[PDB]
Amino acid sequence: NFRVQPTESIVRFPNITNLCPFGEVFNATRFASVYAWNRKRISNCVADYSVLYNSASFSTFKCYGVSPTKLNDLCFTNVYADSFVIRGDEVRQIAPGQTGKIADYNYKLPDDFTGCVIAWNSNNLDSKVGGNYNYLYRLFRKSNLKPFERDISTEIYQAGSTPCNGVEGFNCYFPLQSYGFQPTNGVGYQPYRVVVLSFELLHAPATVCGPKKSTNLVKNKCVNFNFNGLTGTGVLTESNKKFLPFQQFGRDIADTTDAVRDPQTLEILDITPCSFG
Amino acid sequence: EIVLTQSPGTLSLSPGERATLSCRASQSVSSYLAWYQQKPGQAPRLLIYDASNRATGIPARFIGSGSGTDFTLTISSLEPEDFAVYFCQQRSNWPLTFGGGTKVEIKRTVAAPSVFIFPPSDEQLKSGTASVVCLLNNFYPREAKVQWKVDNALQSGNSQESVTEQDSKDSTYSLSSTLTLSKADYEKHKVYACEVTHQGLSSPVTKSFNRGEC
Amino acid sequence: EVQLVQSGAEVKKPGSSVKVSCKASGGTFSNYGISWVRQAPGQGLEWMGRILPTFGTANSAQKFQGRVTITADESTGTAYMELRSLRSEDTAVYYCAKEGLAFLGYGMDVWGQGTTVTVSSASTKGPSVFPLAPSSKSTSGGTAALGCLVKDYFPEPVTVSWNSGALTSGVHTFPAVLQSSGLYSLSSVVTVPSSSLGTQTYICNVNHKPSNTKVDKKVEPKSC
Numbered sequence: 098n099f100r101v102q103p104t105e106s107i108v109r110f111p112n113i114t115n116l117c118p119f120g121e122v123f124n125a126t127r128f129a130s131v132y133a134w135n136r137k138r139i140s141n142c143v144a145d146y147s148v149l150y151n152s153a154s155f156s157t158f159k160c161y162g163v164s165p166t167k168l169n170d171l172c173f174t175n176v177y178a179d180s181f182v183i184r185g186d187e188v189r190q191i192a193p194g195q196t197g198k199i200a201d202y203n204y205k206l207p208d209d210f211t212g213c214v215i216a217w218n219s220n221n222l223d224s225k226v227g228g229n230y231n232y233l234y235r236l237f238r239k240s241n242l243k244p245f246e247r248d249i250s251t252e253i254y255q256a257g258s259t260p261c262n263g264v265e266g267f268n269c270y271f272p273l274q275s276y277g278f279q280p281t282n283g284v285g286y287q288p289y290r291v292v293v294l295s296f297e298l299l300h301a302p303a304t305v306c307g308p309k310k311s312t313n314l315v316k317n318k319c320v321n322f323n324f325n326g327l328t329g330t331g332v333l334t335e336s337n338k339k340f341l342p343f344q345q346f347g348r349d350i351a352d353t354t355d356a357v358r359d360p361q362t363l364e365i366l367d368i369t370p371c372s373f374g
Numbered sequence: 375e376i377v378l379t380q381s382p383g384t385l386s387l388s389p390g391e392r393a394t395l396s397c398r399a400s401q402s403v404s405s406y407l408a409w410y411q412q413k414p415g416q417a418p419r420l421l422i423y424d425a426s427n428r429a430t431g432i433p434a435r436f437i438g439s440g441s442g443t444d445f446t447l448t449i450s451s452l453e454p455e456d457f458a459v460y461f462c463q464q465r466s467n468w469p470l471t472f473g474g475g476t477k478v479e480i481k482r483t484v485a486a487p488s489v490f491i492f493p494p495s496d497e498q499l500k501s502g503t504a505s506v507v508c509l510l511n512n513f514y515p516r517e518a519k520v521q522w523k524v525d526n527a528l529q530s531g532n533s534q535e536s537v538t539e540q541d542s543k544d545s546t547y548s549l550s551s552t553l554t555l556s557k558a559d560y561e562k563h564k565v566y567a568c569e570v571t572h573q574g575l576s577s578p579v580t581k582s583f584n585r586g587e588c
Numbered sequence: 589e590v591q592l593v594q595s596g597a598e599v600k601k602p603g604s605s606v607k608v609s610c611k612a613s614g615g616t617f618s619n620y621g622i623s624w625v626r627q628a629p630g631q632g633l634e635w636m637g638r639i640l641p642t643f644g645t646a647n648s649a650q651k652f653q654g655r656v657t658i659t660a661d662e663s664t665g666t667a668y669m670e671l672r673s674l675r676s677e678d679t680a681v682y683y684c685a686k687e688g689l690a691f692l693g694y695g696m697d698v699w700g701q702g703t704t705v706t707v708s709s710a711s712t713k714g715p716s717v718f719p720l721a722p723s724s725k726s727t728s729g730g731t732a733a734l735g736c737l738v739k740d741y742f743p744e745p746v747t748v749s750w751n752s753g754a755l756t757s758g759v760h761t762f763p764a765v766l767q768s769s770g771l772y773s774l775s776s777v778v779t780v781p782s783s784s785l786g787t788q789t790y791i792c793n794v795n796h797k798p799s800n801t802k803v804d805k806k807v808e809p810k811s812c
């Protein structure tokens with residue numbers, strides 16, 4: 098019995114589907130103020146975090162819940178993406194268990210945070226001469242924000258115990274404040290666009306996660322195959338057979354797997370066990 | 375209502391020295407204090423905000439410090455366009471009150487005021503009002519007293535004073551006082567005079583004229 | 589760069605109303621925050637109130653409440669500071685300056701230009717130029733001061749020049765002082781060497797614009 102072992106292993110998966118367009122979240126024309134941030138929700142797609150990591154254009158990519166390199170292996174039910182613009186000296190506040198005026202009651206991250214945060218400097222779009230007054234932030238609030246809560250009300254904050262009646266006055270502050278984004282500003286006062294991905298694992302089946310890595314096929318050699326999960330060994334060769342449109346693999350007499358269709362060319366292959374004995 | 379008070383009132387120096395202004399707050403503004411500069415016949419412009427942040431375009435010689443109730447604006451090297459009035463505003467809470475001001479002057483050697491007195495003209499005497507003008511010319515410093523003695527009688531409550539700005543060639547001032555009175559009063563008296571008492575004058579100079587005889 | 593173009597000078601009467609505008613040059617408003625500051629003649633600065641244009645919030649200081657009303661027109665980018673029951677002590681130069689969204693912090697960085705509001709009960713009267721002859725030719729034998737004295741004109745300003753602008757060395761034009769009657773007055777003297785007296789003739793030409801008066805008073809010695 099010349100029971101040899103396969104030369105190597107080959108994995109083959111279907112073609113890359115919809116590319117899950119993050120491009121409208123990172124290359125958007127205008128972001129939102131930190132007090133009113135976007136929460137675009139992702140769904141069934143193929144998320145490619147690889148380009149995000151090796152982009153060589155971001156300043157902060159500190160990632161908390163999961164390892165950056167395992168992003169393409171773990172698979173999640175749903176993914177969110179928050180987006181806003183803040184100052185340089187304030188990006189340090191976008192982290193679990195942090196305090197300040199823009200992390201405490203502008204954007205609170207939970208302690209058990211599992212997603213992670215991206216931020217890059219853009220002092221060429223959000224900063225114009227004379228000031229860019231399209232970017233506001235709240236600096237007064239009755240109470241602290243609980244994690245992942247949005248507040249956009251603009252009732253005049255009453256600091257004291259006097260009635261205030263909707264106008265500014267003694268101990269009546271306007272809740273919001275503007276960023277004086279001027280080109281001539283040192284780092285730490287310049288705008289910083291921030292995107293916060295928050296992966297969710299809900300009781301529903303996972304629909305959003307990374308692409309599978311296929312490899313080139315080999316014929317008439319003994320290898321270890323993996324076609325959409327089913328694994329084993331055997332020679333792969335063409336066969337004058339047919340499968341129904343919806344059926345991927347067949348099971349022979351004595352109920353064993355005998356032929357599988359590779360999900361790249363829709364071509365039928367027979368898994369003949371490598372000659373033994 | 376927070377009351378700000380600046381000190382001193384004039385703070386006159388020389389070009390090239392170092393200035394030090396104070397904006398002693400009444401209450402306790404945390405650190406919100408803005409410094410403005412107003413040149414004569416112009417609008418104020420912001421220099422230092424948040425008590426330490428220099429506004430855009432401001433030269434590096436303007437430095438601010440202080441916190442709580444005592445602040446300070448310091449100019450390291452005075453330049454000819456650094457002589458103006460400086461205001462400080464507390465942006466703590468309603469209402470944003472301002473301060474008094476500090477007219478940063480220019481210092482120079484003490485000068486003696488030239489004195490001229492002009493009797494009323496006969497054209498101006500056609501009506502019932504006669505005005506006598508005593509002119510103080512090219513003196514320094516600003517402080518100078520002018521007092522009238524009509525027939526050696528002290529005149530008060532009827533004269534008005536006007537002083538020019540500091541000259542741009544020799545930093546000397548100029549003063550003019552007017553003796554506003556009726557024709558009947560003018561024709562009832564004989565001798566008019568104005569006296570000038572200045573720091574740079576050894577003795578109070580007094581020039582006089584006799585009514586009609588001129 | 590933002591600009592704040594403002595209205596022009598407005599002479600009024602006691603008990604009347606004044607409406608100062610502060611149009612934003614560059615289009616419409618944004619999250620600016622605009623405050624109104626006035627400065628009395630020969631005094632400091634005073635803060636009256638502020639408006640939030642886009643968020644629709646505006647009121648004035650407790651001293652000015654019930655009398656001032658700040659409004660805005662976001663379509664035209666123009667803010668108004670209508671002031672009622674004008675009093676004789678309400679004459680000043682009114683400014684408008686953007687100061688950033690919230691009222692604590694940054695400060696007014698871009699100012700307007702000033703809107704002089706003169707409130708009195710007098711009518712546009714021409715100046716009465718009277719000569720200040722070079723009297724008492726005994727001072728120093730080589731120096732002399734002479735000049736005309738503009739009196740009883742309203743309102744400001746009047747511009748005095750000597751020899752049609754050909755003489756400016758040693759020329760002093762004192763600020764106008766408001767008399768009790770309600771009319772202004774200012775002098776204008778020039779220092780002249782005693783040698784030129786009796787050979788050169790000096791003539792001060794006043795130019796009052798409200799009453800378009802052009803007077804030419806030649807100043808001479810004391811009728812010899």
